[PDB]
Amino acid sequence: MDSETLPESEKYNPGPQDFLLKMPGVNAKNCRSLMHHVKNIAELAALSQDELTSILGNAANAKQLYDFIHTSFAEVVSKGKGKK
Amino acid sequence: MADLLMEKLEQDFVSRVTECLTTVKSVNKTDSQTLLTTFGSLEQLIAASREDLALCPGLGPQKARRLFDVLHEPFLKVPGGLEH
């Protein structure tokens, strides 16, 4: 029922899941659904903005996630709007 | 909304990536800043290998291995056969 809702979450790999559970647009609900659909965090980072949009259902959350992943914080802290 | 503001986008982003790296027991904030300057983006962080993490300016293969697991390991272990 609903991308399966089984109490198996206790056996889910606590390491990779943690990285997903702390994703930007991925919230508790979406995270569950992600871990069930996507093989791993590497995959969500390797996929297209359409793929995660389809799984999350929210283009925004998906966008946030994808945009976040493929942007570089250090470059934003290095340049752009004015940095010294 | 991620692009709600860029001034806070970078702040939240570095914050989120810091905990992301520290998803493993061994990696601490020290390593977080280390990988930040090394890769600078979440994309490269996940794309980084045990070696990519070890080649960093002061990490060590031990933490690199643990992050490689979180960054390459499935969420549900084996939902059938994406891996095995």
From Swiss-Prot, chain A:
Q: Where in the cell is it found?
A: Nucleus; Chromosome
Post-translational note = Acetylation at Lys-79 by KAT5 promotes interaction with ERCC1 by disrupting a salt bridge between Glu-75 and Lys-79, thereby exposing a second binding site for ERCC1. Deacetylated by SIRT1.
State the superkingdom: Eukaryota
Identify residues that carry N6-acetyllysine: 79
Q: Which residues form a coiled coil?
A: none
Q: What segment(s) does the record annotate as region HhH2, dimerization with ERCC1?
A: 5-73
Q: Which pathological condition is tied to this protein?
A: Xeroderma pigmentosum complementation group F: An autosomal recessive pigmentary skin disorder characterized by solar hypersensitivity of the skin, high predisposition for developing cancers on areas exposed to sunlight and, in some cases, neurological abnormalities. The skin develops marked freckling and other pigmentation abnormalities. XP-F patients show a mild phenotype.
On subunit structure and binding partners, the annotation says: Heterodimer composed of ERCC1 and ERCC4/XPF. Interacts with SLX4/BTBD12; this interaction is direct and links the ERCC1-ERCC4/XPF complex to SLX4, which may coordinate the action of the structure-specific endonuclease during DNA repair.
Q: What does this protein do?
A: Catalytic component of a structure-specific DNA repair endonuclease responsible for the 5-prime incision during DNA repair, and which is essential for nucleotide excision repair (NER) and interstrand cross-link (ICL) repair.
Q: Tell me its family.
A: Belongs to the XPF family.
Protein name, UniProt field: DNA repair endonuclease XPF
Instruction: Tell me what organism the protein belongs to.
Output: Homo sapiens
What lineage does UniProt assign to this protein's organism?
A: Eukaryota, Metazoa, Chordata, Craniata, Vertebrata
UniProt lists the gene as ERCC4
Q: Which residues of the full protein are shown?
A: 834 to 916 of 916
From Swiss-Prot, chain B:
Q: Where is the signal peptide?
A: none
Question: What does the PTM comment state?
Answer: Ubiquitinated with both 'Lys-48' and 'Lys-63' linkages. Deubiquitinated by USP45.
Answer yes or no on keyword DNA damage. Answer: yes
Record keywords, A-Z: Acetylation, Cataract, Cytoplasm, DNA damage, DNA repair, DNA-binding, Isopeptide bond, Nucleus, Ubl conjugation
GO CC terms of this entry: chromosome, telomeric region; cytoplasm; ERCC4-ERCC1 complex; nucleoplasm; nucleotide-excision repair complex; nucleotide-excision repair factor 1 complex
Q: What is the effect of changing residue 3 to A?
A: Impaired interaction with ERCC4
Q: Which disease is it linked to?
A: Cerebro-oculo-facio-skeletal syndrome 4: A disorder of prenatal onset characterized by microcephaly, congenital cataracts, facial dysmorphism, neurogenic arthrogryposis, growth failure and severe psychomotor retardation. COFS is considered to be part of the nucleotide-excision repair disorders spectrum that include also xeroderma pigmentosum, trichothiodystrophy and Cockayne syndrome.
What gene does this protein come from?
Answer: ERCC1
User: What is known about its subunit structure?
Assistant: Heterodimer composed of ERCC1 isoform 1 and ERCC4/XPF. Interacts with USP45.
> Under which name does UniProt file this protein?
DNA excision repair protein ERCC-1
Top-level taxonomic group: Eukaryota
Q: Mutating residue 5 to A: effect? A: Impaired interaction with ERCC4
Q: A biological process (GO) annotation for this entry?
A: negative regulation of protection from non-homologous end joining at telomere
Which family is this sequence assigned to?
A: Belongs to the ERCC1/RAD10/SWI10 family.
**Mutating residue 6 to A has which effect?**
Impaired interaction with ERCC4
GO MF annotations, alphabetized = damaged DNA binding; promoter-specific chromatin binding; single-stranded DNA binding; TFIID-class transcription factor complex binding
